[PDB]
Symmetry: C4
Subunit: 91 residues, 4 copies
């Protein structure tokens, strides 16, 4: 479960990285950063896509990727972080 969610998140992020570095001309790391803050709904305070293609893609990217990214964060904290803490609270 966590593995599949992990793999799906990676693939989604790779897709955004390729798109923004190609269409919006961002350096790869910046495209990855934008993809991450966008899907986690944190938001980027400086960059906004400048092309109409970038705007449409971002809109679709958001609706399709948010559910996945949060499903991953949800399990990452509940089934991988909670225990390491919970079992650690045991005297």
């Amino acid at each position: 479960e966590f593995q599949v969610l992990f793999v799906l998140t990676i693939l989604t992020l790779i897709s955004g990285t390729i798109f923004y570095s190609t269409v919006e001309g961002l350096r790869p790391i910046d495209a990855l950063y934008f993809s991450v803050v966008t899907l986690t709904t944190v938001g980027d305070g400086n960059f906004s896509p400048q092309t109409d293609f970038g705007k449409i893609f971002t809109i679709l990217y958001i609706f399709i990727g948010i559910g996945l990214v949060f499903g991953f964060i949800h399990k990452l904290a509940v089934n991988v972080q909670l225990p390491s803490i919970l079992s650690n609270l045991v005297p």
Copy 2:
């Protein structure tokens, strides 16, 4: 369910698109982009409504539209994305 949620989301987004392109003078695609990043809580890093009418509308737009948009994203991933993946994990 997913259909109704889909239709309701579209109508909400169309409303924002019309409002911002008319009151804030944004190009239609930009008004749609702003409506989308606002309701998904991602946020726009460059634009903020400039008129008092735009600010009040955005405030009300947020409170009324967030619940809907996320109800749609929730089902879009759970009742339309999960299966295509779940049934796909079956050897």
Copy 3:
């Protein structure tokens, strides 16, 4: 329930409005706008508090107000929006 949540949200927003218009010198409507986009986690693309007092308050404002604001949005859509739609889907 919805009434109490409504009243609590209003009081929280009034507090932010007074704080930002006084300490950060924002026009009242702008202080209200900032308070709203901050507590709904949408975020403001142009303004960030400039004083250390504004930064500390915003930090505490966020932790205390997000839960409330979303509890209100949750009920606003589930116990006030769902029905108006659900009962409306009945032929």
Copy 4:
């Protein structure tokens, strides 16, 4: 529970404060502010990490810290705010 969540949130925020004030050169209060608005997904409208180290850290910081921060906000409102209000609604 609330205590542990509180302590874990503090440690996470201290880590971000140290990182951004050191690598991105932000004043401590600004580093704390950025760490807070980032993990609560509110977002900062003016600052974005400028170094590649800052971008990578923020990406990892987000995935690991969001779950915790919201687990804390969830309990802060449900097991510490709800009662003070609920028991207060009793005539």
